[PDB]
Structure 1
Amino acid sequence: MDPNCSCATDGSCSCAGSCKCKQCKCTSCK
């Protein structure tokens, strides 16, 4: 797992539009 970003790898993260990840890099919300 990652520190700042805590998005899974299943793809159920569906972050963005309300992401609180500090260092998120899910391609889109990167």
Structure 2
Amino acid sequence: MDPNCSCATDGSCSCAGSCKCKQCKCTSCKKSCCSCCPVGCAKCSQGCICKEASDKCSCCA
């Protein structure tokens, strides 16, 4: 339940993207690296390239 994930660390959590974690450690959870892109974004797959403002981004299509 490190600063970045508040979940149980025993493998059992089913948060599946409804958590508020920054960097969730649950295998059920596939949230995006940013608020401006879907989790599937091609330009961000090797690493997030956006500025963490939130809102909406100019670097991805």
TM-score per shorter chain, which class?
A: 0.3 to 0.5
Aligned Cα RMSD in Å? 5.7
**TM-score, reference length from structure 1:** 0.45
Q: Higher Cα Rg: structure 1 or 2? A: 2
Q: Using CA pairs under 8 Å that are at least 6 residues apart, name the structure with larger relative contact order, 1 or 2.
A: 1
Aligned residues between the structures? 29
Name structure 1 gaps, 5 residues minimum: none
Task: Name segments (4+ residues, structure 1) moved above 6 Å.
Answer: none
**TM-score, reference length from structure 2:** 0.32
Distance in structure 1 (CA, Å) of the matches to 2:25 and 2:9: 12
